[PDB]
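Supplementary Note 3. Input sequence used for the single-chain structure prediction.
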Amino acid sequence: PKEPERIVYDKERVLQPIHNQLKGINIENVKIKEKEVVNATVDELQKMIDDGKLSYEELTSIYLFRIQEHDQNGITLNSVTEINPNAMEEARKLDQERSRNKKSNLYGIPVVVKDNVQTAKVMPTSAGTYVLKDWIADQDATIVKQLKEEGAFVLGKANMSEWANYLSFTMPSGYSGKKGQNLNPYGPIMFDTSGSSSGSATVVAADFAPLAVGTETTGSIVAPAAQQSVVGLRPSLGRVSRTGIIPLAETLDTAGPMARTVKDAATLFNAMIGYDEKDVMTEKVKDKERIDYTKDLSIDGLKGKKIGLLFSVDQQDENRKAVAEKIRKDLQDAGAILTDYIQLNNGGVDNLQTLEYEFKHNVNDYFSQQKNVPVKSLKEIIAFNKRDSNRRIKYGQTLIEASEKSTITKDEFEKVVQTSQENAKKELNKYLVEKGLDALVMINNEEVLLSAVAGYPELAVPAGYDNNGEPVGAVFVGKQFGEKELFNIGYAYEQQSKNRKPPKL
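The predicted structure, written as discrete structure tokens, is reproduced below.
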């Protein structure tokens, strides 16, 4: 992959919606409440408005102001693709019906969803592409529809690696032909943002939003979360509906919550989960009940837990040696039994061929359902990009070209997926279920291939910063349908370490 550059497309796409609903606002009250809102958890934000020292309209104003001054100006992280023009109108209405309709922790809380998540009549869904930059979907994604059932509203959309990082091998992470290059708030250009949920990681890292929604095929959530020092969760395959999300490979596709705090992540995770008749994958959770993932979160959640390490401190470079060593300490200091150095075996577990065949089919089937989409096939996209290469495909489109002319048959595909799932699931259970380990911890995204295919949940927690200041996260692998135990484990590791530091913008 090539290096990231300071490239920003269509800046007025974000500024004008911000500028329009910030004409009748006092900048004095904004900057004052800004210092009290930044790095504050969701629970703390609810306390600031219960005491009357803040409101939802003010909360939204601060974020929009920060996006205007930091994301599209100043340091210019360029992590926001779209902004809800009705963000203030919805915020004020949530203030009026607050004392009457308040019920959930998510009420009035602005949420930023990934650019590949559908919203109705308001914000375009493009998956970071230039060809879909202006296409507004007909219906909301189910996760968006369920979000507004608890009071939450979509503040805007986050930047991402185009096509969920499936365009070319040379394209830098965080880049999209729609908005441009995403920059890491801990060190622009210097540090990569990772992908493909780069923007969803940045908006919560730079306090552009309290919560964010990302998608993951293989590491697209936990890797940018670790690279930008924020919390990211990949749910079990079937826990969260994918309906209303531009796919990549429905075999692996999933949508997870992202925040600065494990607590806040679980708060968002409450409204994302549920049942969906449209997504047949969510019929593996039908015989289960909805839970509050914020109640059973104790600081002694690591007491007695058996975490298997997927990294070795001694074999680590001098740069990450100090960070990796502190991970073991914090786990031990919290009272957990650590298991040596477990080296997972990636054998027979395919990822690329699963993507090459399924991408063309998922995309074409996706566009066939839409009403007024400017493209109805992957073939038309390829032809569209060719007409202005330097703009629409600066780093090419080799991957989507390979998927279009793929020779792989459906028999070869479903057979590979079958063997891959049985291998990864057995490899994981070998340590998790068989040897009685509660969870597996890794550094960054070194071991995501197995847990993604097997459908096991993943939780990224800020593990600190190396000698150069580059963010390093600790991603936990939980057991199947064990998001409840993962959050409890993740919360205990988070509080008994506190590695995350707010970035200097």
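The first strand starts at residue 80 and ends at 83. Residues 1-505 form a domain with the Amidase signature (AS) enzymes fold (CATH 3.90.1300.10).
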